[PDB]
Amino acid sequence: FRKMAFPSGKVEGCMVQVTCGTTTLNGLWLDDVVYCPRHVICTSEDMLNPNYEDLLIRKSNHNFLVQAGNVQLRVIGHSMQNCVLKLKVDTANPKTPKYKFVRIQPGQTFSVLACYNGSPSGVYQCAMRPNFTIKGSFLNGSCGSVGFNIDYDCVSFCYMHHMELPTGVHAGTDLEGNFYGPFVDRQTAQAAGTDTTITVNVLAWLYAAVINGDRWFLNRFTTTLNDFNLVAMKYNYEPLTQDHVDILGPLSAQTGIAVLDMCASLKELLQNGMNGRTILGSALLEDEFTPFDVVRQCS
Amino acid sequence: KMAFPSGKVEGCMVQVTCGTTTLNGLWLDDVVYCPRHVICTSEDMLNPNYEDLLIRKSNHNFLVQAGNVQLRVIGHSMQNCVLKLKVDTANPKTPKYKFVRIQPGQTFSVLACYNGSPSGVYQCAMRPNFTIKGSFLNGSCGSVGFNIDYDCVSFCYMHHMELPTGVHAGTDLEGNFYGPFVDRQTAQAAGTDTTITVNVLAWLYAAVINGDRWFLNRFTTTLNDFNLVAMKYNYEPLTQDHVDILGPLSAQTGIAVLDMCASLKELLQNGMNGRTILGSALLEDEFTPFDVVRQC
Ligand SMILES: *[C@@H](O)[C@H](C[C@@H]1CCNC1=O)NC(=O)[C@H](CC(C)C)NC(=O)OC[C@H]1C[C@H]2C=C[C@@H]1C2
Ligand SMILES: *[C@@H](O)[C@H](C[C@@H]1CCNC1=O)NC(=O)[C@H](CC(C)C)NC(=O)OC[C@H]1C[C@H]2C=C[C@@H]1C2
């Protein structure tokens, strides 16, 4: 199994750069609106603790330089929605895909198109950790890079990048400007909750192992969801939600292994360890492949 | 693990059908490139005589679809294991491009496609035994691998087959296989694979830059003494050019190349002792020094 990103072209066609003064970051051009992190209006010294409302009152449309490549896009209106700036422009992006804005749950994966100066650099697959950080590759200038999934022809934008935490992990918002997790866009020391293992994805990985004929860990037992959740927390695993049980439906149907039976198998692995064995050629249980990701790759 | 943005290549993918065989093609200017085994039936694939099969085909036996639009084939030729279909329409999305043949150990991005439609993108290395550890399913043939420098796409790989071990094999865009493989439906084994040493070192430097350095030691080693141990463990030899290529990473961390070689030697001989490096229980060898530097 590989970490596999979505093809990035539909998103590449929407990336622009947004500059205020000497502060440049990336923005997302869809129809006649450009979306970007609001801290573009900050001087490096204002980031220490900004008054975003006051900073924005001092700004007019003519203070924003929006460029697709080196071609300027005229700004004709501006507003702030939570931690994102919305810049109305006078041209509708002809490369606008079908799209929607979605807010993802921890454990879900998405592709990130890492951009600098409005130019795409690379694409890679990320998982939202239970503590609402992602383990990305972001350098200075990457803010406004977005995360997305593609279904049929429709791009679901789920993440916009805003900051790095002292531990090296990354934090950001949805495209309505609401942060994932307890973070704020200020240049202050912030810490994430202790992280935990994404149980639903581990289960997905065990199903993937079964599909490929690696099934020594299946046992004759089952468990209740509540008993499993209480044990899992003792091992720093996330509890399962009803939605987790449901998104494992397809893999459970494909293998004929009930979700709660697989939970009983995982519980035994947690309590007894691997006893020197491997699963899918690995002594470690993988937690960054979702049930959808497994299905994508097995077919 | 980071792939190049795939948009410039997505604009070139089309579907190619002959008989009941469908796969992907690469549409550049007015030529579509695709694996020649699209002309085969099931019976043909066992032991195909491609020159003989091809002479019995006419332009009109090839159906090329760019989305909903059929392109008319007005000519066809075969270059090694690649078929070239001339069409009456030029692709306006053709990027600036080159065809290159990559060396083992080098990396590239793969745009996996099915029925002419892009499905996913990921980074691959050309293995020393000239296989690639890909993610390719039925219908993925004609998917391509590439690198992007400035605005120029360098195509280096077209996908043709899977081996019994689950790894993959294919050609450059001149239709010559990487490795001792043939485009026939028969079980083929690869030579013994080895680990790409210069890439393991680059990845160890990456682990340090990101604050992970439990595996370091104060020891050192000569280049030849390291290479003796490397070969024993089926690692590729490290050349002086490899050492030179690692310089920037050495300077950046202040760890001399041969000091990192001494760390790797200790890892090969003692294992990781249950510990991990950048999250992995195994030494990763599909990041080049360039891949690591760019991303830092
Ligand atoms: C995008 O503008 C940038 C992205 C950062 C740069 C390094 N890697 C990233 O992910 N964000 C940025 O500089 C933000 C800006 C504020 C207004 C939110 N601040 C930031 O990333 O601060 C990083 C922290 C972590 C410790 C080191 C520096 C400070 C403290
Ligand atoms: C593309 O047409 C297809 C891609 C394969 C299909 C499964 N995964 C892949 O990478 N190639 C293909 O079917 C070739 C065709 C011949 C003429 C080269 N054959 C092939 O890949 O054989 C299937 C594998 C699976 C095991 C049985 C036969 C070999 C090993």
Side-chain angles (χ1 to χ4, degrees), chain A residues 23-26 37 39-40 42-43 47 50 52 116 137-144 159 161-171 179 184-190:
Chain A
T23 302
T24 300
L25 41 63
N26 306 285
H39 70 259
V40 71
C42 293
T43 61
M47 293 173 189
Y52 282 111
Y116 300 92
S137 179
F138 292 112
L139 307 176
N140 292 343
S142 61
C143 288
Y159 179 82
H161 182 53
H162 294 240
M163 52 173 344
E164 184 168 301
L165 295 183
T167 67
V169 301
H170 296 101
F179 262 90
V184 295
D185 51 347
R186 288 122 56 82
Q187 192 89 26
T188 191
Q190 295 170 66

mmCIF file of all heavy atoms in Angstrom, chain A residues 23-26 37 39-40 42-43 46-48 50 52 116 137-144 159 161-171 179 184-190, ligand 1, unseen atoms left out:
data_model
loop_
_atom_site.group_PDB
_atom_site.id
_atom_site.type_symbol
_atom_site.label_atom_id
_atom_site.label_comp_id
_atom_site.label_asym_id
_atom_site.label_seq_id
_atom_site.Cartn_x
_atom_site.Cartn_y
_atom_site.Cartn_z
ATOM 1 N N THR A 23 4.099 40.864 2.532
ATOM 2 C CA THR A 23 3.595 39.579 3.009
ATOM 3 C C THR A 23 2.870 38.899 1.849
ATOM 4 O O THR A 23 1.846 39.397 1.383
ATOM 5 C CB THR A 23 2.664 39.776 4.198
ATOM 6 O OG1 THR A 23 3.360 40.467 5.244
ATOM 7 C CG2 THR A 23 2.185 38.434 4.732
ATOM 8 N N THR A 24 3.412 37.786 1.364
ATOM 9 C CA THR A 24 2.791 37.046 0.277
ATOM 10 C C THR A 24 2.421 35.656 0.767
ATOM 11 O O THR A 24 3.189 35.005 1.478
ATOM 12 C CB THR A 24 3.709 36.933 -0.958
ATOM 13 O OG1 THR A 24 4.030 38.240 -1.464
ATOM 14 C CG2 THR A 24 3.030 36.150 -2.064
ATOM 15 N N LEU A 25 1.227 35.213 0.406
ATOM 16 C CA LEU A 25 0.875 33.818 0.611
ATOM 17 C C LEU A 25 0.006 33.394 -0.560
ATOM 18 O O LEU A 25 -0.120 34.123 -1.555
ATOM 19 C CB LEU A 25 0.212 33.608 1.973
ATOM 20 C CG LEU A 25 -0.800 34.612 2.510
ATOM 21 C CD1 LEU A 25 -1.992 34.655 1.596
ATOM 22 C CD2 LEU A 25 -1.211 34.263 3.946
ATOM 23 N N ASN A 26 -0.547 32.190 -0.466
ATOM 24 C CA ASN A 26 -1.353 31.611 -1.526
ATOM 25 C C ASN A 26 -2.831 31.858 -1.270
ATOM 26 O O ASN A 26 -3.283 31.931 -0.122
ATOM 27 C CB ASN A 26 -1.102 30.105 -1.602
ATOM 28 C CG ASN A 26 0.346 29.783 -1.750
ATOM 29 O OD1 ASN A 26 0.922 29.950 -2.807
ATOM 30 N ND2 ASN A 26 0.948 29.297 -0.681
ATOM 31 N N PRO A 37 -5.740 33.029 3.875
ATOM 32 C CA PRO A 37 -5.636 33.260 5.329
ATOM 33 C C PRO A 37 -5.636 34.747 5.609
ATOM 34 O O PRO A 37 -5.000 35.535 4.897
ATOM 35 C CB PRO A 37 -4.295 32.624 5.692
ATOM 36 C CG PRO A 37 -4.075 31.595 4.605
ATOM 37 C CD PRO A 37 -4.568 32.285 3.382
ATOM 38 N N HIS A 39 -4.177 36.378 7.892
ATOM 39 C CA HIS A 39 -2.958 37.020 8.369
ATOM 40 C C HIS A 39 -2.099 37.583 7.254
ATOM 41 O O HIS A 39 -1.028 38.132 7.536
ATOM 42 C CB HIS A 39 -2.132 36.076 9.263
ATOM 43 C CG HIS A 39 -1.469 34.925 8.564
ATOM 44 N ND1 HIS A 39 -1.987 33.649 8.599
ATOM 45 C CD2 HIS A 39 -0.271 34.823 7.940
ATOM 46 C CE1 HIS A 39 -1.160 32.820 7.990
ATOM 47 N NE2 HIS A 39 -0.115 33.505 7.572
ATOM 48 N N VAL A 40 -2.537 37.521 5.994
ATOM 49 C CA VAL A 40 -1.831 38.261 4.969
ATOM 50 C C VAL A 40 -1.841 39.764 5.250
ATOM 51 O O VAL A 40 -0.954 40.469 4.776
ATOM 52 C CB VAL A 40 -2.427 37.925 3.579
ATOM 53 C CG1 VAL A 40 -3.808 38.511 3.397
ATOM 54 C CG2 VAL A 40 -1.500 38.349 2.463
ATOM 55 N N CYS A 42 -1.182 41.157 7.975
ATOM 56 C CA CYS A 42 -0.288 41.428 9.093
ATOM 57 C C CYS A 42 1.113 41.785 8.641
ATOM 58 O O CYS A 42 1.694 41.135 7.771
ATOM 59 C CB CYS A 42 -0.183 40.218 10.024
ATOM 60 S SG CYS A 42 -1.671 39.866 10.871
ATOM 61 N N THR A 43 1.677 42.795 9.294
ATOM 62 C CA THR A 43 3.114 42.960 9.281
ATOM 63 C C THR A 43 3.726 41.877 10.156
ATOM 64 O O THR A 43 3.112 41.420 11.122
ATOM 65 C CB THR A 43 3.488 44.339 9.817
ATOM 66 O OG1 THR A 43 3.026 44.465 11.171
ATOM 67 C CG2 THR A 43 2.852 45.433 8.962
ATOM 68 N N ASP A 46 3.089 42.600 13.488
ATOM 69 C CA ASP A 46 1.707 42.499 13.951
ATOM 70 C C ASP A 46 1.293 41.067 14.243
ATOM 71 O O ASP A 46 0.321 40.852 14.974
ATOM 72 C CB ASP A 46 0.734 43.067 12.918
ATOM 73 N N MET A 47 1.981 40.087 13.662
ATOM 74 C CA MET A 47 1.621 38.699 13.912
ATOM 75 C C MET A 47 1.814 38.311 15.372
ATOM 76 O O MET A 47 1.164 37.366 15.837
ATOM 77 C CB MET A 47 2.442 37.789 12.998
ATOM 78 C CG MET A 47 2.080 37.945 11.527
ATOM 79 S SD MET A 47 3.146 37.048 10.387
ATOM 80 C CE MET A 47 2.591 37.691 8.812
ATOM 81 N N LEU A 48 2.670 39.033 16.107
ATOM 82 C CA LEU A 48 2.910 38.711 17.512
ATOM 83 C C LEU A 48 1.605 38.666 18.294
ATOM 84 O O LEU A 48 1.375 37.744 19.082
ATOM 85 C CB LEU A 48 3.874 39.729 18.127
ATOM 86 N N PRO A 50 -2.257 40.040 16.706
ATOM 87 C CA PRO A 50 -2.928 40.987 15.818
ATOM 88 C C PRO A 50 -4.339 41.302 16.267
ATOM 89 O O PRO A 50 -5.001 40.484 16.907
ATOM 90 C CB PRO A 50 -2.924 40.255 14.463
ATOM 91 C CG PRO A 50 -2.530 38.814 14.773
ATOM 92 C CD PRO A 50 -2.480 38.661 16.246
ATOM 93 N N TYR A 52 -7.214 41.741 14.176
ATOM 94 C CA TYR A 52 -7.544 41.564 12.763
ATOM 95 C C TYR A 52 -8.615 42.548 12.306
ATOM 96 O O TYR A 52 -8.530 43.106 11.202
ATOM 97 C CB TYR A 52 -7.983 40.116 12.515
ATOM 98 C CG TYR A 52 -6.804 39.177 12.437
ATOM 99 C CD1 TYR A 52 -6.561 38.232 13.434
ATOM 100 C CD2 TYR A 52 -5.920 39.244 11.377
ATOM 101 C CE1 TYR A 52 -5.479 37.383 13.360
ATOM 102 C CE2 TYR A 52 -4.829 38.410 11.296
ATOM 103 C CZ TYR A 52 -4.617 37.465 12.288
ATOM 104 O OH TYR A 52 -3.540 36.616 12.228
ATOM 105 N N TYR A 116 3.929 27.700 -3.232
ATOM 106 C CA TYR A 116 4.730 28.850 -2.832
ATOM 107 C C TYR A 116 4.582 29.915 -3.906
ATOM 108 O O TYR A 116 4.782 29.639 -5.090
ATOM 109 C CB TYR A 116 6.189 28.428 -2.627
ATOM 110 C CG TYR A 116 6.271 27.379 -1.559
ATOM 111 C CD1 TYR A 116 6.213 26.021 -1.873
ATOM 112 C CD2 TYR A 116 6.310 27.737 -0.217
ATOM 113 C CE1 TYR A 116 6.247 25.068 -0.887
ATOM 114 C CE2 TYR A 116 6.348 26.804 0.758
ATOM 115 C CZ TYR A 116 6.308 25.459 0.433
ATOM 116 O OH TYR A 116 6.341 24.547 1.446
ATOM 117 N N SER A 137 4.396 18.838 5.077
ATOM 118 C CA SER A 137 5.677 19.403 4.667
ATOM 119 C C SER A 137 5.364 20.809 4.177
ATOM 120 O O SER A 137 4.893 20.999 3.050
ATOM 121 C CB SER A 137 6.351 18.568 3.589
ATOM 122 O OG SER A 137 7.580 19.156 3.208
ATOM 123 N N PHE A 138 5.605 21.783 5.042
ATOM 124 C CA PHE A 138 5.276 23.174 4.779
ATOM 125 C C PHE A 138 6.461 24.047 5.157
ATOM 126 O O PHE A 138 6.983 23.941 6.272
ATOM 127 C CB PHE A 138 4.061 23.615 5.578
ATOM 128 C CG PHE A 138 2.768 22.971 5.175
ATOM 129 C CD1 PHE A 138 2.140 22.088 6.018
ATOM 130 C CD2 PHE A 138 2.145 23.300 3.979
ATOM 131 C CE1 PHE A 138 0.939 21.521 5.692
ATOM 132 C CE2 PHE A 138 0.932 22.736 3.648
ATOM 133 C CZ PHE A 138 0.328 21.844 4.515
ATOM 134 N N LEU A 139 6.877 24.908 4.241
ATOM 135 C CA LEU A 139 7.929 25.879 4.495
ATOM 136 C C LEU A 139 7.306 27.272 4.579
ATOM 137 O O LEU A 139 6.096 27.448 4.396
ATOM 138 C CB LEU A 139 9.001 25.782 3.406
ATOM 139 C CG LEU A 139 9.549 24.367 3.209
ATOM 140 C CD1 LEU A 139 10.529 24.297 2.051
ATOM 141 C CD2 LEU A 139 10.203 23.880 4.499
ATOM 142 N N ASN A 140 8.127 28.273 4.908
ATOM 143 C CA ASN A 140 7.637 29.644 4.849
ATOM 144 C C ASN A 140 7.040 29.894 3.476
ATOM 145 O O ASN A 140 7.577 29.441 2.468
ATOM 146 C CB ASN A 140 8.753 30.653 5.099
ATOM 147 C CG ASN A 140 9.278 30.606 6.510
ATOM 148 O OD1 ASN A 140 8.638 30.068 7.414
ATOM 149 N ND2 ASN A 140 10.450 31.188 6.712
ATOM 150 N N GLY A 141 5.920 30.609 3.444
ATOM 151 C CA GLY A 141 5.263 30.931 2.201
ATOM 152 C C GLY A 141 4.187 29.954 1.780
ATOM 153 O O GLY A 141 3.495 30.218 0.787
ATOM 154 N N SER A 142 4.005 28.862 2.521
ATOM 155 C CA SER A 142 3.043 27.818 2.167
ATOM 156 C C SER A 142 1.624 28.111 2.630
ATOM 157 O O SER A 142 0.693 27.431 2.191
ATOM 158 C CB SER A 142 3.483 26.484 2.776
ATOM 159 O OG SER A 142 3.535 26.565 4.191
ATOM 160 N N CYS A 143 1.412 29.098 3.499
ATOM 161 C CA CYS A 143 0.052 29.379 3.944
ATOM 162 C C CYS A 143 -0.877 29.664 2.772
ATOM 163 O O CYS A 143 -0.480 30.240 1.743
ATOM 164 C CB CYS A 143 0.031 30.553 4.889
ATOM 165 S SG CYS A 143 0.746 30.081 6.475
ATOM 166 N N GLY A 144 -2.124 29.218 2.915
ATOM 167 C CA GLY A 144 -3.081 29.288 1.843
ATOM 168 C C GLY A 144 -3.086 28.084 0.929
ATOM 169 O O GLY A 144 -4.026 27.934 0.145
ATOM 170 N N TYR A 159 -9.316 21.928 3.773
ATOM 171 C CA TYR A 159 -8.253 22.453 4.614
ATOM 172 C C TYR A 159 -7.577 23.623 3.924
ATOM 173 O O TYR A 159 -7.360 23.589 2.711
ATOM 174 C CB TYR A 159 -7.204 21.376 4.938
ATOM 175 C CG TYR A 159 -6.033 21.828 5.800
ATOM 176 C CD1 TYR A 159 -6.138 21.897 7.187
ATOM 177 C CD2 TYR A 159 -4.811 22.122 5.231
ATOM 178 C CE1 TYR A 159 -5.067 22.294 7.954
ATOM 179 C CE2 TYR A 159 -3.742 22.518 5.994
ATOM 180 C CZ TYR A 159 -3.872 22.591 7.352
ATOM 181 O OH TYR A 159 -2.796 23.008 8.116
ATOM 182 N N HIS A 161 -4.059 26.091 4.885
ATOM 183 C CA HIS A 161 -2.944 26.027 5.822
ATOM 184 C C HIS A 161 -2.637 27.390 6.439
ATOM 185 O O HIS A 161 -2.522 28.389 5.713
ATOM 186 C CB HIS A 161 -1.690 25.500 5.138
ATOM 187 C CG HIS A 161 -0.546 25.385 6.082
ATOM 188 N ND1 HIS A 161 -0.641 24.691 7.270
ATOM 189 C CD2 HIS A 161 0.697 25.910 6.042
ATOM 190 C CE1 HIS A 161 0.506 24.785 7.918
ATOM 191 N NE2 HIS A 161 1.329 25.529 7.199
ATOM 192 N N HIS A 162 -2.462 27.418 7.778
ATOM 193 C CA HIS A 162 -2.164 28.670 8.477
ATOM 194 C C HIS A 162 -0.902 28.660 9.344
ATOM 195 O O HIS A 162 -0.284 29.715 9.501
ATOM 196 C CB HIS A 162 -3.310 29.096 9.402
ATOM 197 C CG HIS A 162 -4.577 29.468 8.707
ATOM 198 N ND1 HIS A 162 -5.154 30.717 8.820
ATOM 199 C CD2 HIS A 162 -5.411 28.741 7.930
ATOM 200 C CE1 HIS A 162 -6.278 30.747 8.130
ATOM 201 N NE2 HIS A 162 -6.463 29.556 7.585
ATOM 202 N N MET A 163 -0.504 27.541 9.959
ATOM 203 C CA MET A 163 0.617 27.674 10.884
ATOM 204 C C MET A 163 1.286 26.351 11.237
ATOM 205 O O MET A 163 0.762 25.256 11.013
ATOM 206 C CB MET A 163 0.160 28.350 12.166
ATOM 207 C CG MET A 163 -1.043 27.687 12.785
ATOM 208 S SD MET A 163 -1.541 28.307 14.405
ATOM 209 C CE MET A 163 -0.087 29.218 14.937
ATOM 210 N N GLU A 164 2.465 26.496 11.832
ATOM 211 C CA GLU A 164 3.241 25.397 12.386
ATOM 212 C C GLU A 164 3.276 25.511 13.902
ATOM 213 O O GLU A 164 3.309 26.617 14.454
ATOM 214 C CB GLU A 164 4.663 25.411 11.807
ATOM 215 C CG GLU A 164 5.557 24.261 12.228
ATOM 216 C CD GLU A 164 6.829 24.184 11.393
ATOM 217 O OE1 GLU A 164 6.735 24.037 10.154
ATOM 218 O OE2 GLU A 164 7.927 24.285 11.968
ATOM 219 N N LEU A 165 3.231 24.385 14.561
ATOM 220 C CA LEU A 165 3.309 24.312 16.002
ATOM 221 C C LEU A 165 4.732 24.003 16.432
ATOM 222 O O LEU A 165 5.540 23.510 15.642
ATOM 223 C CB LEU A 165 2.349 23.243 16.524
ATOM 224 C CG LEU A 165 0.872 23.553 16.292
ATOM 225 C CD1 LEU A 165 0.010 22.484 16.902
ATOM 226 C CD2 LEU A 165 0.498 24.912 16.864
ATOM 227 N N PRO A 166 5.081 24.297 17.687
ATOM 228 C CA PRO A 166 6.468 24.078 18.132
ATOM 229 C C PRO A 166 6.971 22.667 17.897
ATOM 230 O O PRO A 166 8.167 22.483 17.639
ATOM 231 C CB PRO A 166 6.408 24.419 19.629
ATOM 232 C CG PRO A 166 5.236 25.343 19.767
ATOM 233 C CD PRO A 166 4.240 24.885 18.743
ATOM 234 N N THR A 167 6.095 21.661 17.946
ATOM 235 C CA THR A 167 6.490 20.271 17.739
ATOM 236 C C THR A 167 6.700 19.902 16.272
ATOM 237 O O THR A 167 7.040 18.750 15.986
ATOM 238 C CB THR A 167 5.435 19.344 18.335
ATOM 239 O OG1 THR A 167 4.220 19.468 17.591
ATOM 240 C CG2 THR A 167 5.163 19.706 19.786
ATOM 241 N N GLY A 168 6.498 20.829 15.338
ATOM 242 C CA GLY A 168 6.716 20.557 13.933
ATOM 243 C C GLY A 168 5.484 20.142 13.154
ATOM 244 O O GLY A 168 5.572 19.986 11.929
ATOM 245 N N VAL A 169 4.345 19.953 13.816
ATOM 246 C CA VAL A 169 3.118 19.603 13.117
ATOM 247 C C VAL A 169 2.399 20.890 12.728
ATOM 248 O O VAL A 169 2.798 21.993 13.127
ATOM 249 C CB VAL A 169 2.220 18.688 13.966
ATOM 250 C CG1 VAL A 169 2.972 17.405 14.331
ATOM 251 C CG2 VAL A 169 1.718 19.407 15.214
ATOM 252 N N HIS A 170 1.322 20.757 11.967
ATOM 253 C CA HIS A 170 0.739 21.886 11.265
ATOM 254 C C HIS A 170 -0.732 22.018 11.612
ATOM 255 O O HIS A 170 -1.397 21.056 11.991
ATOM 256 C CB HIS A 170 0.968 21.721 9.765
ATOM 257 C CG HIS A 170 2.420 21.744 9.408
ATOM 258 N ND1 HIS A 170 3.146 20.600 9.148
ATOM 259 C CD2 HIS A 170 3.301 22.770 9.357
ATOM 260 C CE1 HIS A 170 4.402 20.930 8.901
ATOM 261 N NE2 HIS A 170 4.522 22.239 9.025
ATOM 262 N N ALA A 171 -1.234 23.241 11.461
ATOM 263 C CA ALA A 171 -2.603 23.549 11.823
ATOM 264 C C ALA A 171 -3.199 24.539 10.827
ATOM 265 O O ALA A 171 -2.506 25.369 10.234
ATOM 266 C CB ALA A 171 -2.683 24.120 13.239
ATOM 267 N N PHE A 179 -10.837 27.170 12.445
ATOM 268 C CA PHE A 179 -9.718 26.287 12.720
ATOM 269 C C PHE A 179 -10.205 24.887 13.067
ATOM 270 O O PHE A 179 -11.269 24.696 13.668
ATOM 271 C CB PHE A 179 -8.873 26.816 13.864
ATOM 272 C CG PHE A 179 -7.664 27.575 13.424
ATOM 273 C CD1 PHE A 179 -7.727 28.942 13.225
ATOM 274 C CD2 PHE A 179 -6.454 26.921 13.217
ATOM 275 C CE1 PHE A 179 -6.600 29.637 12.827
ATOM 276 C CE2 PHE A 179 -5.337 27.608 12.819
ATOM 277 C CZ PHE A 179 -5.398 28.980 12.644
ATOM 278 N N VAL A 184 -5.319 29.287 17.261
ATOM 279 C CA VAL A 184 -5.666 30.615 16.769
ATOM 280 C C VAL A 184 -4.523 31.111 15.898
ATOM 281 O O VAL A 184 -3.370 30.703 16.064
ATOM 282 C CB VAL A 184 -5.938 31.601 17.934
ATOM 283 C CG1 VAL A 184 -7.174 31.178 18.727
ATOM 284 C CG2 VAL A 184 -4.740 31.673 18.844
ATOM 285 N N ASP A 185 -4.838 32.012 14.956
ATOM 286 C CA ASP A 185 -3.809 32.542 14.054
ATOM 287 C C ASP A 185 -3.098 33.749 14.679
ATOM 288 O O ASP A 185 -3.234 34.894 14.254
ATOM 289 C CB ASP A 185 -4.407 32.869 12.686
ATOM 290 C CG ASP A 185 -5.667 33.741 12.739
ATOM 291 O OD1 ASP A 185 -6.282 33.952 13.803
ATOM 292 O OD2 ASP A 185 -6.077 34.214 11.652
ATOM 293 N N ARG A 186 -2.289 33.453 15.700
ATOM 294 C CA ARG A 186 -1.385 34.407 16.328
ATOM 295 C C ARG A 186 -0.025 33.756 16.477
ATOM 296 O O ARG A 186 0.074 32.548 16.717
ATOM 297 C CB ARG A 186 -1.885 34.848 17.695
ATOM 298 C CG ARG A 186 -3.085 35.767 17.631
ATOM 299 C CD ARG A 186 -4.268 35.195 18.387
ATOM 300 N NE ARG A 186 -3.944 34.906 19.776
ATOM 301 C CZ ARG A 186 -3.948 35.806 20.748
ATOM 302 N NH1 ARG A 186 -4.237 37.079 20.515
ATOM 303 N NH2 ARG A 186 -3.652 35.424 21.986
ATOM 304 N N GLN A 187 1.022 34.561 16.329
ATOM 305 C CA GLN A 187 2.391 34.069 16.415
ATOM 306 C C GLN A 187 2.786 33.891 17.885
ATOM 307 O O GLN A 187 3.691 34.539 18.405
ATOM 308 C CB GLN A 187 3.327 35.027 15.693
ATOM 309 C CG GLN A 187 4.718 34.492 15.468
ATOM 310 C CD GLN A 187 4.849 33.731 14.176
ATOM 311 O OE1 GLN A 187 4.102 33.960 13.223
ATOM 312 N NE2 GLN A 187 5.817 32.829 14.123
ATOM 313 N N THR A 188 2.066 32.992 18.555
ATOM 314 C CA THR A 188 2.293 32.653 19.951
ATOM 315 C C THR A 188 2.493 31.146 20.081
ATOM 316 O O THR A 188 2.020 30.358 19.255
ATOM 317 C CB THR A 188 1.118 33.101 20.837
ATOM 318 O OG1 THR A 188 1.488 32.989 22.217
ATOM 319 C CG2 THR A 188 -0.110 32.235 20.589
ATOM 320 N N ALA A 189 3.197 30.746 21.136
ATOM 321 C CA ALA A 189 3.429 29.327 21.367
ATOM 322 C C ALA A 189 2.109 28.645 21.698
ATOM 323 O O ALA A 189 1.366 29.090 22.581
ATOM 324 C CB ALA A 189 4.440 29.122 22.493
ATOM 325 N N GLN A 190 1.801 27.586 20.957
ATOM 326 C CA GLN A 190 0.576 26.828 21.136
ATOM 327 C C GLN A 190 0.930 25.354 21.095
ATOM 328 O O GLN A 190 1.878 24.953 20.417
ATOM 329 C CB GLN A 190 -0.472 27.142 20.054
ATOM 330 C CG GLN A 190 -0.978 28.572 20.094
ATOM 331 C CD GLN A 190 -1.811 28.918 18.878
ATOM 332 O OE1 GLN A 190 -2.890 28.363 18.682
ATOM 333 N NE2 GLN A 190 -1.325 29.852 18.078
HETATM 334 C C1 LIG C 1 2.393 30.820 6.429
HETATM 335 O O1 LIG C 1 2.262 32.231 6.470
HETATM 336 C C2 LIG C 1 3.228 30.301 7.594
HETATM 337 C C3 LIG C 1 3.463 28.791 7.503
HETATM 338 C C4 LIG C 1 4.502 28.286 8.504
HETATM 339 C C5 LIG C 1 5.912 28.802 8.241
HETATM 340 C C6 LIG C 1 6.814 27.676 8.704
HETATM 341 N N1 LIG C 1 5.973 26.505 8.492
HETATM 342 C C7 LIG C 1 4.678 26.779 8.532
HETATM 343 O O2 LIG C 1 3.764 25.940 8.594
HETATM 344 N N2 LIG C 1 2.573 30.640 8.858
HETATM 345 C C8 LIG C 1 3.121 31.411 9.805
HETATM 346 O O3 LIG C 1 4.228 31.932 9.688
HETATM 347 C C9 LIG C 1 2.294 31.620 11.077
HETATM 348 C C10 LIG C 1 1.661 33.010 11.065
HETATM 349 C C11 LIG C 1 0.751 33.335 12.249
HETATM 350 C C12 LIG C 1 0.123 34.713 12.089
HETATM 351 C C13 LIG C 1 -0.326 32.279 12.425
HETATM 352 N N3 LIG C 1 3.073 31.413 12.289
HETATM 353 C C14 LIG C 1 3.780 30.280 12.445
HETATM 354 O O4 LIG C 1 3.798 29.373 11.645
HETATM 355 O O5 LIG C 1 4.438 30.287 13.615
HETATM 356 C C15 LIG C 1 5.227 29.103 13.896
HETATM 357 C C16 LIG C 1 5.489 29.041 15.386
HETATM 358 C C17 LIG C 1 6.064 27.700 15.870
HETATM 359 C C18 LIG C 1 7.288 28.133 16.722
HETATM 360 C C19 LIG C 1 8.305 28.636 15.745
HETATM 361 C C20 LIG C 1 7.840 29.762 15.231
HETATM 362 C C21 LIG C 1 6.540 30.069 15.911
HETATM 363 C C22 LIG C 1 6.801 29.471 17.295
#
